[PDB]
Amino acid sequence: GEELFTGVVPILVELDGDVNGHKFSVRGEGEGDATNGKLTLKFICTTGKLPVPWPTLVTTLVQCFSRYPDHMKRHDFFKSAMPEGYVQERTISFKDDGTYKTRAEVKFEGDTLVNRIELKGIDFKEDGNILGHKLEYNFNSHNVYITADKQKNGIKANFKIRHNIEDGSHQYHRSPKTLQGSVQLADHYQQNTPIGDGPVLLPDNHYLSTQSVLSKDPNEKRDHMVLLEFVTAAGIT
Asked: In which tissues or organs does this protein occur?
């Protein structure tokens, strides 16, 4: 488990998606450094233009790279499930808009940590913030609240993602939007279960403090996202 993450680990992410019938695929590659809670990935839309905003896929696109402090190592379910891995399932409910349902397997394939995801999105509004591409190219910082799911030998998580809504204040100096109008909320409901049959660590309640930086590669012609993430576990003193 945790022993597999003490160095720098290559990462592969593969996603097939269907949102309101728009099919797309994403591939990401990079590396993870759990000792420092950090990973760096570059994602490409391999099917052309991504039909949803990149930020709406960030949570779907490897919490095993979180940095658990020494006193909290006993609560790291994600690494404990390795190398066999875990299934990660979510419902993501966009306020006043559609829903994503995701099923992923996160596991080692050789020396590489691989996240393979199927995503289905339904009931999106054509001129809403998602299909209308009205989201800032960035990502707020969040607390991901984790609890043991004893019944399933796994974990559950709940959290509320705040996606910033775009304007460049077009042409004129517009007042900043009121809080409710400035964000598109995405309620996340998450369940993880081990793939292997051996013992896993079932945690006490805690959270992951996540921080993300989104950027572009100036030499990349494909629709893409470069992502840095830094995540630490907390909530137990």
From this structure: Photocytes.
